Write a protein that binds this ligand. Structure first.
Ligand SMILES: [Cu+2]
Ligand SMILES: [Cu+2]
Ligand SMILES: [Cu+2]
Ligand SMILES: [Cu+2]
Ligand SMILES: [Cu+2]
Ligand SMILES: [Cu+2]
Lengths: 333, 333, 333
């Protein structure tokens, strides 16, 4: 049976970008093959030069977004090169059995493995490393991403009418817990293992030191802001593998939102802000109507503006005065 | 076009009360005009006399609830008198473009401005101050309120049948982060600017020192409890601009609840408790069936009973023994 | 009227197990009688021997799950024996009036009382102790449980088709706040009253020291794991009386989930993780398709793996290679 199915290999891209795919399936079920390489590396996460030992899927935080269709088979080749120091694995919330695949994918440095699972449920799911005994440490070190399982006939609104996006971006939100000394300065370590003991004490406080989008404070700002034009329909996938978040598009809305990200449920309409539970991926669809800069944020404003959970969208087009206008510009009373 | 529309001026009232309005629109689209004055002031928030420098819209925490209908135009005149010390602005989650209006409304002390926006989506939304670089500080100092955009034909249940409330109250929940000395006593400052540096460190802990309804511990209790009678349908609008909350009416339920507050979605039925994400306003409708005192609370009971998130409802009418009755009054075994 | 109704007495069982009942009602409305005895006792909650003074309903944390049908009358006899030291009461979120029954059930040691209330709304609700002035202290000491009010015709899916479970388990999640000394070691006390003052300071930090299922770290693991077989439909009721949680079944899904637990609402489909607000009970239905061990967890992985919020399910049956298979077992590159 599987023997007889067609197979296509897909090369992943760096977040916030997503690999090429079809919204509405043009072929029947296939075996979609992906390859990911584990990369343990130093990453500076803020302006002051704070550095951490990140554990990544393909060198990025978050790992890349995989896109398949309902009932396709996902075949993943996972490589943990000998240059790494730790054992890793992968658990797909999209999969059924063996701890999402975690129990079948344990690889020490120098090993690789190939897992296959059937994508039976449509929606966006989280995938993350989960080694027995060090689960939270690997997850909060940036070792998580997401996979989107699109219905074979694309997305639909609450009335069952088609929703087609022109652009899609993937925003992975990460909570970090950097160990501190007595005065409050962040610690620095030589290898991941040296950090271990302190990492555990830092996590138990339940208070992140940083909460960032795409691995660093300011990662999606300035020259890296997400782009769009007035009239374009944009799908924004957002994941949080360990902690709750509440996305909000400043100056806009989530016209159609699947906060818990499962496509067999009708979406929520006109959301100002929505709650994505830790350990979940959600998706919001919106059509831009005004040009300018928009701030995309986690709406606990301290987490957004003090801790790093903020990104930008710079949109082009003509301003619509019917929607909004300054009647009297700021001036002396 | 707008030139030709009728205009009505509306005078706002102090929360928990709401200005007069029609549920079902009796006229066509209008330009609804409001005026708000910014007031920086000292406020004692608890029993022990803890004082803070509140930044308010119209002198209250939360700012007043504005009520309009879908497709009306909201025209707001914002005044920042010369007696204030800081720059402020306003961002409406209900609006489209320019950061909800934040980028078009920056006024220094002594200035005013007039913004107009079209209310295209029905529901309850949050509005708040959001000056570049000091967003969380202004929001957590009480500078936020809400606006309700009612469908032109009023509220409806999941089956599309009309829901008419007899009373409406607005509950604004506020998380405060008062700076403390080494022993844990709260600090006091002369002006808002003197507090700034410490405020930022207090917020980063992510742990509020107080969480209150209507600006103070006990604000909605005793002589200030909300009132109703058995048989009255009450709509309770609740907002939280920065942090999640989970409202609950002790001894009652939320018969119809729009937890994320957007009226084009059918409401959730018979809720015991519901989650309102930080940066959102929600609404719950209930019909009183029993008389007596009810406690309205944020259901993290530590936040409610230790931190200040608790209010009362005292309802009049006849007791119904079919619903509840004490068969054997407390007595010695 | 009530005089004329039939009455059945039901003996409760220890969580995670549930007392015998009918899903679809075979008789008409009845007066269902229950008896609960309050038990103040020492409980060691972790591996290191940390001990607390738990306040329980029937000797367990959580208290037992009561199951009735919509429109039955619940008659509870509550006994607070003279061996206890504190005043207690009970508030049912399922009931209407008198603070859920809290104001009608105050019993000092040596007293008992009998309350009756009509179960007008279907769903799973939380019930908990709530004495004026010490509400959070009694709740966070383990004094809470849940009650399920089933529709007279059983559970249904979003299309109104019947959902019948073969097994049902009750998982009560508890956040504990154990006082610590300067070095971080947990304190020990002789009686509940001796703990009081310190308990209040510990709770105000808003950071639990332990978050457990069924009263202790590891309570639902090893020889106590929940059991099932491939093909069995399992309903898992989960409650959290004070704090938000986000359940997740590792290696599985929530096929039908009522996150806020009210049965008149259609369930959410294919959830990976769902949010249950503090002060609420929810229910998830799932059909096992793969054998093996599954970890049932609160998906903030620090709370799950560091703090104690983790349990197991060991399921029997044949492995399905179509759903999942290891194509290449972990080996040297
Ligand atoms: Cu790993
Ligand atoms: Cu997971
Ligand atoms: Cu301001
Ligand atoms: Cu905002
Ligand atoms: Cu008690
Ligand atoms: Cu309660």
């Amino acid at each position: 049976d599987i023997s007889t199915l067609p197979r296509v290999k897909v090369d992943l891209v760096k977040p916030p970008f997503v690999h090429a795919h079809d919204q509405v399936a043009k072929t029947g079920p296939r075996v979609v093959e992906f390859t990911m390489t584990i990369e343990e590396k130093k990453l500076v996460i803020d302006r002051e030069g704070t550095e951490i030992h990140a554990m990544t899927f393909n060198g990025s935080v978050p790992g890349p977004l995989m896109v398949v269709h309902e009932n396709d088979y996902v075949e993943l080749r996972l490589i943990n090169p000998d240059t790494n120091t730790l054992l890793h694995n992968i658990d797909f919330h999209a999969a059924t059995g063996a701890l999402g695949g975690g129990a079948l994918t344990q690889v020490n440095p120098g090993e690789e493995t190939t897992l296959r699972f059937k994508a039976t449920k449509p929606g966006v799911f989280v995938y993350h490393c989960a080694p027995e005994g060090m689960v939270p440490w690997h997850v909060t070190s940036g070792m998580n991403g997401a996979i989107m399982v699109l219905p074979r006939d694309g997305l639909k609104d609450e009335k069952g009418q088609p929703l087609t996006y022109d652009k899609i971006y993937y925003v992975g939100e990460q909570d970090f817990y950097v160990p501190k000394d007595e005065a409050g300065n962040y610690k620095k370590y030589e290898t991941p293992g040296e950090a271990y003991e302190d990492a555990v004490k830092a996590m138990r406080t339940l208070t992140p030191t940083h909460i960032v989008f795409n691995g660093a404070v300011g990662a999606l700002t300035g020259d890296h802001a997400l782009t769009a034009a007035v009239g374009e329909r944009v799908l924004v996938v957002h994941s949080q593998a360990n902690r709750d978040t509440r996305p909000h598009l400043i100056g806009g809305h989530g016209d159609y939102v699947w906060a818990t990200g499962k496509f067999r449920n009708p979406p929520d309409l006109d959301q100002e802000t929505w709650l994505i539970p830790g350990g979940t991926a959600g998706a919001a669809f919106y059509t831009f109507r005004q040009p300018g800069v928009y701030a995309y944020v986690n709406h606990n404003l301290i987490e957004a503006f003090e801790l790093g959970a903020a990104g930008h969208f710079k949109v082009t087009g003509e301003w619509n005065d019917d929607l909004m206008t300054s009647v009297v510009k700021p001036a002396s009373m």
